[PDB]
Amino acid sequence: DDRRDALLERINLDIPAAVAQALREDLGGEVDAGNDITAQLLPADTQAHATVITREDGVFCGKRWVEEVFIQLAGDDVRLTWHVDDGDAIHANQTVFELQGPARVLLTGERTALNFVQTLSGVASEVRRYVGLLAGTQTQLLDTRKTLPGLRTALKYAVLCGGGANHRLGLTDAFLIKENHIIASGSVRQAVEKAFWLHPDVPVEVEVENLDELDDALKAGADIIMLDNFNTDQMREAVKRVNGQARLEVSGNVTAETLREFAETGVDFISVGALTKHVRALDLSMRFC
Amino acid sequence: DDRRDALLERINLDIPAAVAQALREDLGGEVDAGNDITAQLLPADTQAHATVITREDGVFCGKRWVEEVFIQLAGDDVRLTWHVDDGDAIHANQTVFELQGPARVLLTGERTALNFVQTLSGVASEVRRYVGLLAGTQTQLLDTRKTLPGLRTALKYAVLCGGGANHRLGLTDAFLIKENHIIASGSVRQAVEKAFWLHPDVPVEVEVENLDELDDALKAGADIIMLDNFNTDQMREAVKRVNGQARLEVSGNVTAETLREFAETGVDFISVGALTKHVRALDLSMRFC
Ligand SMILES: O=C(O)c1cccnc1C(=O)O
Numbered sequence: 275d276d277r278r279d280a281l282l283e284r285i286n287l288d289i290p291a292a293v294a295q296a297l298r299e300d301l302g303g304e305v306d307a308g309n310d311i312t313a314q315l316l317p318a319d320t321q322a323h324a325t326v327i328t329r330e331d332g333v334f335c336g337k338r339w340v341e342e343v344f345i346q347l348a349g350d351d352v353r354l355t356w357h358v359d360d361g362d363a364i365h366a367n368q369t370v371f372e373l374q375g376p377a378r379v380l381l382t383g384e385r386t387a388l389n390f391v392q393t394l395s396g397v398a399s400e401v402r403r404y405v406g407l408l409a410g411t412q413t414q415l416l417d418t419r420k421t422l423p424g425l426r427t428a429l430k431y432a433v434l435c436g437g438g439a440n441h442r443l444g445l446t447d448a449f450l451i452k453e454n455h456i457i458a459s460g461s462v463r464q465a466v467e468k469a470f471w472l473h474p475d476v477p478v479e480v481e482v483e484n485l486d487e488l489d490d491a492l493k494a495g496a497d498i499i500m501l502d503n504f505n506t507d508q509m510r511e512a513v514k515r516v517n518g519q520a521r522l523e524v525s526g527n528v529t530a531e532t533l534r535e536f537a538e539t540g541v542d543f544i545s546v547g548a549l550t551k552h553v554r555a556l557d558l559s560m561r562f563c
Numbered sequence: 564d565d566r567r568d569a570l571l572e573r574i575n576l577d578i579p580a581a582v583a584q585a586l587r588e589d590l591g592g593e594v595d596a597g598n599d600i601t602a603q604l605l606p607a608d609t610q611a612h613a614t615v616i617t618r619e620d621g622v623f624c625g626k627r628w629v630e631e632v633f634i635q636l637a638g639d640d641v642r643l644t645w646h647v648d649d650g651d652a653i654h655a656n657q658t659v660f661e662l663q664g665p666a667r668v669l670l671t672g673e674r675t676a677l678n679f680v681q682t683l684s685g686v687a688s689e690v691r692r693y694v695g696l697l698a699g700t701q702t703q704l705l706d707t708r709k710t711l712p713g714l715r716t717a718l719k720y721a722v723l724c725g726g727g728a729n730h731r732l733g734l735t736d737a738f739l740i741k742e743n744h745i746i747a748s749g750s751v752r753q754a755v756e757k758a759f760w761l762h763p764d765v766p767v768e769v770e771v772e773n774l775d776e777l778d779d780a781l782k783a784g785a786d787i788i789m790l791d792n793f794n795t796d797q798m799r800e801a802v803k804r805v806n807g808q809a810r811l812e813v814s815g816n817v818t819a820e821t822l823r824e825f826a827e828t829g830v831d832f833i834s835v836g837a838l839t840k841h842v843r844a845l846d847l848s849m850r851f852c
């Protein structure tokens with residue numbers, strides 16, 4: 275699969291585009307470090323060195339965004355000293371990285387730098403706790419397209435650092451056949467045929483609602499099949515008749531302990547939307563030694 | 564105060580860009596609705612009628628954002644039907660708005676329009692929860708500069724819709740002097756003083772760690788003073804000694820009930836970042852008929 279390399283490229287091209295904007299909203303439309311009024315109260319060479327410390331256990335994510343924010347503002351002039359990486363388990367009070375550079379800048383860059391990290395890390399921390407219960411199982415967590423507008427790619431990254439796998443990037447890289455769709459084409463068969471013909475190289479998923487609808491999907495050549503409302507028993511039986519090509523995705527947006535039962539049934543994937551549609555930002559701060 | 568104007572005028576510009584942002588991440592690069600591949604398997608004319616609905620009581624917010632997704636995908640080819648207005652009581656299973664238009668479109672714009680509403684309405688709903696504990700006092704709830712990257716204004720707007728007040732929108736429209744600044748200036752008096760010399764018109768707020776610095780800055784003429792770390796009693800006596808020009812702000816992301824006791828003291832503003840750094844999307848679905 276290349277989606278990993280497809281994601282990895284897209285975020286690189288997207289990080290500056292977003293960081294640019296985050297700083298723009300803070301500095302009144304323009305990205306000029308001098309626009310910070312309150313910072314003007316310091317002599318333009320007063321050197322400084324702060325430290326960012328997490329105040330709760332979690333998982334780190336957001337390194338690339340940080341480096342970018344200061345780069346935009348005063349590249350080469352602010353040195354960074356990381357203690358952790360984009361996927362590490364962080365402990366309460368553990369200091370995450372230190373900053374070196376002109377006072378004015380650190381103060382301006384503070385908010386935006388922390389805002390990116392609190393978010394991405396908040397999400398990455400949530401994902402892991404979610405993936406923690408699928409241990410000793412051969413089932414995998416997954417994301418959706420229910421993300422905060424703008425942070426699409428970045429959230430898929432944090433989901434990644436959290437320990438989950440990603441789903442289609444959007445409407446472009448994958449087919450998600452549904453009831454409406456199956457009706458328009460006449461059959462599942464005819465549906466996945468016109469699909470595999472529209473754009474040959476993309477994967478096709480057909481949404482099934484019952485065990486029988488699922489057979490017609492298997493034989494159809496659909497590489498992934500999501501089940502909408504099957505109970506522990508039907509899921510278990512479903513898997514049993516699939517095997518090869520058996521790419522089952524359960525939309526298990528539901529409860530914590532239910533997660534365990536689903537995974538238990540050997541179903542390939544469990545997509546959770548709550549992972550990227552809500553954010554409990556990690557508690558962080560920048561102290562000045 | 565013109566902040567409302569400055570705000571509503573910024574969003575007026577920010578919305579088309581933000582709708583265009585999410586409409587690109589999902590359509591792999593460009594706002595070309597034809598990019599949705601699964602949509603191609605559908606009859607290019609079959610109109611439909613979709614109804615959005617929330618599964619929970621809260622507050623609405625997002626109309627101009629929704630109105631912009633669909634215009635942007637099919638200028639005047641889709642018709643919306645509004646029941647609630649931005650900042651209105653929403654009721655479990657209440658119909659929010661309807662959609663009349665081509666199904667190929669309604670399907671694509673679905674996810675993007677809904678993410679906006681889920682987020683904004685999610686935030687707005689919880690601000691109402693907060694302002695609702697302030698009935699009786701003269702205390703104004705404020706936001707901070709702790710917002711998810713990109714949605715600075717959208718969240719500042721959603722905050723109004725909930726009942727809260729807007730604190731500055733960036734580093735460029737007011738002074739917020741913390742210990743760090745106070746250090747280089749020499750003292751507190753000297754810092755406020757110096758601030759007034761540079762930018763004569765933009766409001767000046769200084770953060771004070773104790774009573775000596777309180778009246779020390781009060782006499783210097785600042786307009787709002789942030790009381791950092793005051794316990795109940797000290798806050799109460801501070802309210803006292805200020806009286807005139809008593810724009811006393813107390814950043815209190817402390818807790819649901821200790822929040823009341825604070826405002827009780829008769830302090831002016833309580834800025835809670837907890838409102839825009841965390842997102843608990845509102846549960847809505849857009850069902851077909
Ligand atoms: O479109 C998707 O990728 C998707 C796939 C799995 C579950 N839901 C979604 C969604 O965004 O609603």
Ligand SMILES: O=C(O)c1cccnc1C(=O)O
Binds near residue numbers: 706707730731834836
């Ligand atoms: O103006 C601010 O930046 C602000 C306003 C009051 C409280 N907090 C903040 C903050 O972002 O830390």
